[PDB]
């Protein structure tokens, strides 16, 4: 029912051993060197 100006799909593949790192405030190899998320991030993460 809501409406936003733009949405961005950020598509990638990760290791299982890094999966919890797709979130604000995470660290590690991937979270620090591969995919960092903003602290004021607004959106939703999907994975399978």
């Amino acid at each position, epitope marked *: 029912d809501l409406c936003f100006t733009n949405v961005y799909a950020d598509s990638f593949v990760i290791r*299982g*051993d*890094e*999966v*919890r*790192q797709i*979130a604000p*405030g*995470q*660290t*590690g*190899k991937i979270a620090d060197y591969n995919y960092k998320l903003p602290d004021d991030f607004t959106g939703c993460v999907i994975a399978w």
Partner: antibody
Amino acid sequence: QVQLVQSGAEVKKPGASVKVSCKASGYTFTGYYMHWVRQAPGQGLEWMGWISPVSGGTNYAQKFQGRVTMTRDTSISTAYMELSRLRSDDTAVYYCARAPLFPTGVLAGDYYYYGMDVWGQGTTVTVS
Amino acid sequence: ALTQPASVSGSPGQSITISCTGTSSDVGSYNLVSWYQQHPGKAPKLMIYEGSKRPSGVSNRFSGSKSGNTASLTISGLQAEDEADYYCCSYAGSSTLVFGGGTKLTVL
């Protein structure tokens, strides 16, 4: 500056009961549900129950339902846990434990999250 | 209630992983898995909480991961001080959050 002190070592006979105290300071006492854990000498941990110092809410493990009883005194900020019908395998070290956050976590999860402050020691030995 | 290896060995500088397998009803439906470290004769210390969030003061070398029904502790840059027992924790349906065997970490 969170300080936690327990009672001393205790020895009991099989079939008797044991009463341990848990006196805290340096924080809001009723704002933290007090959890309890026991550990046999040389074995792993075993959680037993938790008490709410506010409104006196309590809930025990289904492993110990009917044998363990808690009360608390907010006037001196102390918890008290009693084990009844003691047997041989209850010789162990016992701690209380302070839960991590405040009970204002609308979606947080308290007081089921975890334990950041662990207490010193209470050893209960039950031998004939 | 959870199963984790009893003892795993590693080398200094290595990144080591510790597994802990549960079920779909306790670890597979809740993002509430943790890792505790305890030294011999010492008080346990919460290293990893709420999946991979860390209390203030814990080193960044300890991270967490969750896959299906499996929890994983990761340690980057293994050191001599890392020798201790590690327990995985997860809500199981009642009271409540107990550890496991006690993955004893040793350094070669």
